[PDB]
Amino acid sequence: NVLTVYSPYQSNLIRPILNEFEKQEHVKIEIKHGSTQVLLSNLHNEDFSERGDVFMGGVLSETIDHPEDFVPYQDTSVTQQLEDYRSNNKYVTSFLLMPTVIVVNSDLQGDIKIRGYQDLLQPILKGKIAYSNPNTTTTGYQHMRAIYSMHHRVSDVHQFQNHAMQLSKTSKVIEDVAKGKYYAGLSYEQDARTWKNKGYPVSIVYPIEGTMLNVDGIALVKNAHPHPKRKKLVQYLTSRSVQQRLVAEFDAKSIRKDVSEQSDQSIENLKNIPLIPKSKLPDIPHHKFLEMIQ
Numbered sequence: 001n002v003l004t005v006y007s008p009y010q011s012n013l014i015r016p017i018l019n020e021f022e023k024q025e026h027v028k029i030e031i032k033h034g035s036t037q038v039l040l041s042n043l044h045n046e047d048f049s050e051r052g053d054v055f056m057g058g059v060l061s062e063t064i065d066h067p068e069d070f071v072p073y074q075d076t077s078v079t080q081q082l083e084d085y086r087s088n089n090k091y092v093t094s095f096l097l098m099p100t101v102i103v104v105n106s107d108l109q110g111d112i113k114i115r116g117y118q119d120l121l122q123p124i125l126k127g128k129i130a131y132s133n134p135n136t137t138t139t140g141y142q143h144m145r146a147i148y149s150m151h152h153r154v155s156d157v158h159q160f161q162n163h164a165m166q167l168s169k170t171s172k173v174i175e176d177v178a179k180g181k182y183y184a185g186l187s188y189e190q191d192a193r194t195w196k197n198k199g200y201p202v203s204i205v206y207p208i209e210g211t212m213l214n215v216d217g218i219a220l221v222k223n224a225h226p227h228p229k230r231k232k233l234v235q236y237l238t239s240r241s242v243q244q245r246l247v248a249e250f251d252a253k254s255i256r257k258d259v260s261e262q263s264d265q266s267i268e269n270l271k272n273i274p275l276i277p278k279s280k281l282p283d284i285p286h287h288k289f290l291e292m293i294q
């Protein structure tokens with residue numbers, strides 16, 4: 001009866017729409033939360049008969065190390081998706097566009113200028129910047145790729161890491177920045193928005209050197225007795241009306257062509273974000289990049 005979803009998303013983003021799916025389709029949805037790679041690693045070791053049914057969130061098209069744990073499937077509505085961000089991974093349907101961001105505490109900042117990654121290296125900020133474990137999280141990994149992409153120099157990654165404090169959990173970064181434990185941190189757009197809209201002194205910075213754009217994905221998990229409504233769930237999550245609801249309520253960035261663009265207040269439209277072009281981000285497997293920067 002229960003349909004289990006694995007997701008690194010925070011509850012506030014996905015619990016409501018999953019409740020509306022419960023209300024429309026009369027299925028109970030339980031969420032298993034965790035860091036992207038921790039979820040994938042525990043799923044891999046999870047017994048085949050106990051597994052959940054859907055994985056949503058994270059850059060799945062690029063960081064699924066065990067494709068045998070998933071079913072080859074893409075929703076038909078990929079036809080309606082933005083041309084540049086369709087999954088090239090037969091196990092993954094693109095779901096949302098998630099800019100990675102720098103978050104700055106605007107009560108501690110004072111006159112310190114923070115426009116991007118280079119500014120984080122100012123001596124006054126040493127040891128007062130936070131990021132999440134690149135080995136276990138989408139957000140930390142994507143930021144390390146963004147720093148490497150500037151000049152394709154591992155030394156740039158190491159220089160940042162020697163300047164900053166690594167935390168286990170991506171959401172601890174925004175929490176501790178918002179609460180004044182750190183001057184700034186490496187986060188992602190929706191997590192930063194959540195805390196700014198709760199009134200915390202948080203500024204959202206799209207790094208001028210190049211902002212990584214995560215293409216979040218959805219995948220069907222290989223298990224013994226798949227819940228027969230899981231393909232309806234993927235359809236629901238990638239549908240126009242549901243994507244439009246996520247844009248309207250959260251300033252999400254829809255994967256679909258036929259859905260509004262909304263970037264209220266300090267959130268930026270993609271056209272005003274300096275995105276790292278794909279040409280600066282070549283093919284290098286997840287595990288090889290982590291080995292490169294170790």
Ligand SMILES: O=P(O)(O)OC[C@H]1O[C@H](O)[C@H](O)[C@@H](O)[C@@H]1O
Pocket residue numbers: 007008009010034035036037057058059098100132136137138139140142169170171188214216
């Ligand atoms: O804890 P994480 O592995 O960093 O995942 C938390 C979030 O961060 C990433 O940047 C992805 O864009 C999101 O889809 C994901 O839900």
